[PDB]
Design a binder for this molecule. Structure first.
Ligand SMILES: OC[C@@H]1O[C@@H](OC[C@@H]2NC[C@H](O)[C@H]2O)[C@H](O)[C@H]1O
Ligand SMILES: [Ca+2]
Length: 361
């Protein structure tokens, strides 16, 4: 149990010539053999077309090396935004258990279109193959009236793989809404199913992440753009809300809850949720958001009155992400790739591993 924590390891410091914000949107993955993989949006000068770098750690995140790049082999655009890594926990069609997936959005350098893709690695991240196209959208700017798709998140439920994402395609009715599609083979995707939408046109629920709880329930966490009560001097904000459901295909008609910590802190922006068995029968739900450095925890299965907040040494970052370690539930990785543009040339990809038993004190 000794020597497993470490603070602010620098995974990747981009060159001066990368385009603002240079890097962003870090995502980690623990494989069944204990190795870690990571990726981020890599804003290299183009051409050549942008790619998702894949880094590997064998020592629990202390040291890293690049072992491959996921490249767009289909569109001659690049893999540009919102990567997401995922290890299959069971076979889906011809992809066995242990296959690594990388989802993300392929987008031309002019940002005229958006395309959520799935790539797969059969060798724990050394090589990649295109698998399928998921969702095509329009222009890659987060403005009302445009029709892009964004921000894929993968999770298995029973025999289905669910891919949740953000959707502006219903542009006459919702500025953006949250949706999913499912697959049983990674080839054929189900029709679009709504997960969260709001009647007010200018509402923009976005950036969905999901975690399984030990009471047969799932928690769906998102940033509710256009949510009520923007703070003084703000006409529009992105408070973190969530929903609870037994069936993670049916969040749509579940009551929303805002996350507010015991002291009144209101996380906002680009959230990320995990659950670990640490801390009791209920374990611990841990959420990060994009505007605070603290983590927010809940040891009461998502009871709205039970959120707490704790400092960690990893700085605030856009869609700062979290990872739990299968063989040690007390250990939490927090990974970030800096802030939204303008970043001032100072974003780097970094991570910390903390113990909840130390940090929750
Ligand atoms: O990831 C790069 C980033 O994506 C764009 O924003 C997407 C919006 N984020 C919250 C909403 O869910 C979505 O519409 C932004 O232009 C890029 O910097
Ligand atoms: Ca740099």
């Amino acid at each position: 149990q000794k020597g497993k924590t470490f603070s602010n390891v620098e995974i990747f410091d981009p060159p001066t010539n990368y385009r603002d914000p240079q890097v962003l949107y870090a995502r980690p993955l623990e494989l069944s053999d204990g190795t870690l993989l990571g990726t981020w949006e890599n804003y290299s000068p183009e051409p050549p077309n942008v790619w998702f770098p894949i880094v590997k750690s064998k020592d629990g995140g202390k040291t890293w090396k690049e072992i491959s790049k996921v490249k767009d082999t289909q569109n001659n655009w690049g893999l540009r935004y919102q990567p997401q890594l995922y290890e299959l926990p069971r076979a889906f069609g011809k992809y066995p258990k242990g296959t690594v997936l990388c989802s993300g959005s392929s987008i031309p350098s002019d940002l005229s279109e958006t395309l959520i893709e799935v790539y797969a690695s059969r060798d724990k991240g050394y090589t990649w193959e295109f698998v399928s196209h998921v969702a095509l959208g329009g222009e890659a700017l987060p403005n009302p009236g445009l029709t892009p798709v964004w921000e894929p998140f993968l999770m298995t439920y029973k025999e289905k793989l669910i891919l949740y994402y953000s959707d502006q395609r219903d542009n006459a009715t919702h500025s953006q809404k949250l949706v999913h599609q499912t697959t049983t083979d990674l080839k054929k995707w189900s029709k679009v199913v709504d997960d969260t939408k709001y009647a007010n046109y200018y509402a923009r629920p976005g950036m969905p992440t999901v975690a399984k709880l030990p009471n047969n329930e799932y928690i769906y966490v998102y940033a509710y753009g256009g949510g009520p009560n923007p703070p003084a001097g703000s006409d529009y904000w992105f408070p973190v809300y969530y929903r609870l459901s037994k069936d993670p295909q049916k969040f749509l008609n579940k009551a929303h809850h805002q996350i507010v910590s015991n002291d009144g802190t209101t996380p906002a922006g680009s959230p990320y949720v995990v659950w670990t068995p640490y801390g009791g029968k209920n374990g611990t739900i841990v959420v990060s958001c994009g505007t605070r450095s603290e983590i927010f925890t809940n040891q009461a299965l998502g009871d709205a009155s039970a959120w707490k907040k704790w400092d960690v040494p990893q700085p605030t970052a856009y869609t700062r992400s979290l990872l739990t370690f299968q063989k040690d539930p007390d250990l939490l990785m927090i990974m970030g790739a800096g802030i939204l543009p303008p970043a001032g040339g100072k974003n780097t990809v970094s991570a910390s591993v903390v113990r909840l038993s130390e940090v929750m004190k």
